[PDB]
Design a protein around this ligand. Structure first.
Ligand SMILES: Cc1cc2nc3c(=O)[nH]c(=O)nc-3n(C[C@H](O)[C@H](O)[C@H](O)COP(=O)(O)OP(=O)(O)OC[C@H]3O[C@@H](n4cnc5c(N)ncnc54)[C@H](O)[C@@H]3O)c2cc1C
Ligand SMILES: Cc1cc2nc3c(=O)[nH]c(=O)nc-3n(C[C@H](O)[C@H](O)[C@H](O)COP(=O)(O)OP(=O)(O)OC[C@H]3O[C@@H](n4cnc5c(N)ncnc54)[C@H](O)[C@@H]3O)c2cc1C
Ligand SMILES: NC(=O)c1ccc[n+]([C@@H]2O[C@H](COP(=O)([O-])OP(=O)(O)OC[C@H]3O[C@@H](n4cnc5c(N)ncnc54)[C@H](O)[C@@H]3O)[C@@H](O)[C@H]2O)c1
Ligand SMILES: NC(=O)c1ccc[n+]([C@@H]2O[C@H](COP(=O)([O-])OP(=O)(O)OC[C@H]3O[C@@H](n4cnc5c(N)ncnc54)[C@H](O)[C@@H]3O)[C@@H](O)[C@H]2O)c1
Lengths: 443, 442
């Protein structure tokens, strides 16, 4: 570890890599260090839930390569190891370069001293710092209250090791349970159902909502998505609240708060993510209370020489207000912006970030802005229509704050993202939405 | 007037003057422009309610001079007019200077181009900017729902013009009624009661709590302060919720919720302060929701080249969380810090700020930290009365968050600020608040 670096990037993930590329682009000859707790080079997580599961290659868990939108095979890793220079070489190599320090954890942050302390005891002084620590999966209360053997048969799905372990388990066990109905739980349910269709094993999804992804989509769309997920070979059990999890004859037993009971062999828990804010206690950094994570301004700035990007950043969007987004594209855009601002720009967060999803062949969408179930929605579909506050195969769902669009879900329509982005950018008063819904040309 | 200014300070008051002084101290040769909507040069407010009333000099309204703790007469203004340079003279002068552009209001703030627009259409481009606007007095629903005649007879007390108007009114009218029982209301009640006792007129105070300063002091000290204010010649009416204000035979009449009716011919309204945050709408600046005002960090910074100081800043205290202090000492300290940080330092707010108050001769106190009656309270007096949330001439009050001292009120003891400041600095847990009050000479 070098004793001083011009640019420090805490956490090795999407945001840190994007920031390193921006810093290198704007300031040629910059010398960037990335301190990562994972023993791996930066990689993208989205393939860990969809693409690596549908790969035809048998030995994919060891290879980690997949086909793209075009179909050209690529790796999850952002860059090959030859791209990164050694940390010791970093302050000596010509025109700089990015170096990655893997297996290291920053445990202390002295803002005034412009210093951090690693887990092994090494101390690194910086000129500019980015905190791009992400989040960690939340555990279940009933699972925690159970014994050690119950926790041994539970899985939290974030990293590559989780993907490999879950793939081997699905190959070797007879039934797996998914708890949670958000993004990760639903995608895992679809992938595991696809894998289990061949042999004929059982996969179960149970959660306390009315349907799949009930915090994002309206009720009717949630029920439609639930039915589509059931069509993939998954037994979905909505409105289920876990009371206790136990052991019976070598199989774990789920006793719900209701009268229903479930007996299976393995549990996958996808019950949310919480940001890593253990570093704020020693850094004297403010933690947001409404959203969680570090609190930063419109330029993602926490202190004089400290920026925060990614999932842990509770930033201030000027158009939409205080936010905290947890998505791949937001991590890329936010890291790019923080890298621009670390070299000397003063740009606020302006370009909006989107996200995408695919819950099987039938369901596939992209969304932008503020998308939430509590906010008023206007669903203009094809062959159907519904507004809140049957053939829902195609359509657009506007989200309105005060007669103004703040988020758009584009349901099974493609190459119509710029229209939605321009609608969000203009931010006009919209008392009528069928006049604008024709721009996407749903029919 | 100049097209480009290195250092712009929006709003000229206590914080702006302190910031200009810090800028000049750290960076000799600087060129500071102060844009103020007032027609006057910066002055200090605290003597506008206490010192200028007790002066024996007849024409203090014009001189605006008063005596102090040392006893040396000084002006209400921070500096004499010769100290400042002209606005057109600022760009080209050896070692620069400070120029105040009085009577001009900043109406638009464009952070993208680093340019502001004044109310006369002139544009000024800045390199660093400070927003040191203050607050404006809050009005009353009963007053605002009334007619123009009732509005013309009520007073909101912030500036020098209000002080002159109220002094003339006190010399003229027979009865004065004061709404509000916080700091300003109690101080004006004491001053006008002294003047009335000197003359022989009537002064009345009404507020919706059970005692004076019930949002700062505990209940028993609130009752004690209410009694002591009554001894000053002021008829105090606690628990008076105002319903409507009207006129009857050329005299104002107040009808309260409980049924009491009070007649008078002038009203002084002092019911709080609302921060000036109209610049945030056009500047893309974030306004705090819990406390109000511009939301800044521990370094009092809002954007890349923008700092906020004074009563309008909702800053983050590392040791005490989110705060918004509205006091003269805090304005001085925060303006000083923001002026230092505009020149290159990155110092967070660490030095605490205190506040004092004198309510007659018997009651005089100082306070520091988080002082609020909502927090659990332990008071050490001649008889040790601990509050759960006799003679109380002298004592100390500790305010607790959870077994930790966050604010201390010093009751009729002086030259003991450093002890309380040191106690608050190292906020370690205490088994009981006693044996700590021994540090103060009770
Ligand atoms: C299985 C899966 C599938 C996903 N699919 C999608 C998708 O299809 N679309 C989408 O938009 N989003 C998707 N996401 C979300 C997206 O991947 C995340 O939002 C994104 O990875 C967040 O990037 P980040 O850099 O903020 O955090 P992360 O990617 O979590 O990186 C955080 C890194 O920082 C390290 N770290 C933390 N604390 C410290 C410390 N103190 N010291 C050192 N290192 C530290 C961690 O170990 C980790 O390596 C998916 C996520 C998962 C898990
Ligand atoms: C009568 C009175 C007595 C007080 N007594 C005490 C006391 O005994 N002890 C104590 O601790 N505190 C006391 N205070 C409180 C203390 O005086 C204030 O908290 C302090 O003055 C706040 O300073 P500031 O610089 O933030 O605001 P201010 O002093 O209000 O300065 C704001 C200035 O900015 C100007 N401005 C506003 N908007 C704009 C704009 N858009 N463009 C240009 N200029 C603008 C305003 O006109 C004003 O000149 C008293 C206050 C009053 C009114
Ligand atoms: N396609 C995508 O964009 C995508 C895909 C995968 C993951 N992700 C990200 O991964 C992260 C983690 O995913 P996640 O799905 O775990 O997050 P999430 O926030 O979607 O998970 C919350 C889900 O768990 C349920 N839940 C909450 N508490 C519960 C409890 N006590 N018992 C049972 N159910 C409970 C909620 O009602 C909801 O269904 C998120 O940041 C998410 O955005 C995104
Ligand atoms: N000694 C000092 O520190 C001092 C002295 C004077 C002024 N100041 C400052 O001057 C500013 C103005 O003082 P203030 O006394 O107006 O503010 P304040 O916030 O102290 O006033 C609160 C008082 O107004 C009362 N009130 C609120 N709403 C009311 C309503 N609808 N009807 C009746 N009463 C109502 C409250 O009950 C309380 O008695 C404050 O910022 C204060 O800090 C400080």
């Amino acid at each position: 570890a070098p004793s001083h670096v011009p640019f420090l990037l805490i956490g090795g993930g999407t945001a840190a890599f994007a920031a390193a590329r921006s810093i290198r682009a704007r300031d040629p000859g910059a010398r960037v260090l990335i301190v990562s707790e994972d023993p791996e080079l930066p990689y993208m997580r989205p393939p860990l839930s969809k693409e690596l599961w549908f790969s035809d290659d048998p030995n994919v868990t060891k290879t980690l390569r997949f086909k793209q939108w075009n179909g050209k095979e690529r790796s999850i890793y952002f860059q090959p190891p030859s791209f990164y220079v050694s940390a010791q070489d970093l302050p000596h190599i010509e025109n700089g370069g990015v170096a990655v320090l893997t297996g290291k954890k920053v445990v202390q942050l002295d803002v005034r001293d412009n210093m951090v302390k690693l887990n092994d005891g090494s101390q690194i002084t910086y000129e500019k710092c980015l905190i791009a620590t992400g989040g960690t999966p939340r555990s279940l209360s009933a699972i925690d209250r159970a014994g050690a053997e119950v926790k041994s048969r539970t899985t939290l799905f974030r990293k590559i090791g989780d993907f490999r372990s879950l793939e081997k388990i699905s190959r070797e066990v007879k039934s797996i349970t998914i708890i949670g109905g958000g993004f990760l739980g639903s995608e895992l349910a679809c992938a595991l159902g696809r894998k289990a269709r061949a042999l004929g094993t059982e996969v179960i999804q149970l959660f306390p909502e009315k349907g799949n992804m009930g915090k994002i989509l309206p009720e009717y769309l949630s029920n439609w998505t639930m039915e589509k997920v059931r069509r993939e070979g998954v037994k979905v059990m909505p409105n289920a609240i876990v009371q206790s999890v136990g052991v019976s004859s070598g199989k774990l037993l789920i006793k719900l708060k209701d009268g229903r009971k479930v007996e299976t062999d393995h549990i996958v828990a996808a019950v949310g993510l919480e940001p890593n804010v253990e570093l704020a206690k020693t850094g004297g950094l403010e933690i947001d209370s409404d959203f969680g994570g570090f609190r930063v301004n419109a330029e993602l700035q926490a202190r004089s020489n400290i920026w925060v990007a990614g999932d842990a950043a509770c930033f201030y969007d000027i158009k939409l207000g205080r936010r905290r987004v947890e998505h791949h594209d937001h991590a890329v855009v936010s890291g790019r912006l923080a890298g621009e601002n670390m070299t000397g720009a003063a740009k606020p967060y302006w370009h909006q970030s989107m996200f995408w999803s695919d819950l099987g062949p039938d369901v596939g969408y992209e969304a932008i802005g503020l998308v939430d179930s509590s906010l008023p929605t206007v669903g203009v579909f094809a062959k159907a229509t519904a507004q809140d506050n049957e053939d829902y195969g195609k359509g657009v769902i506007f989200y309105l704050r005060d007669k103004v669009v703040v988020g758009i879900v584009l349901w099974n329509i493609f190459n119509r993202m710029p229209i939605a982005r321009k609608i969000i950018k203009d931010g006009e008063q919209h008392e009528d939405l069928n006049e604008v819904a024709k721009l996407f040309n749903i029919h």
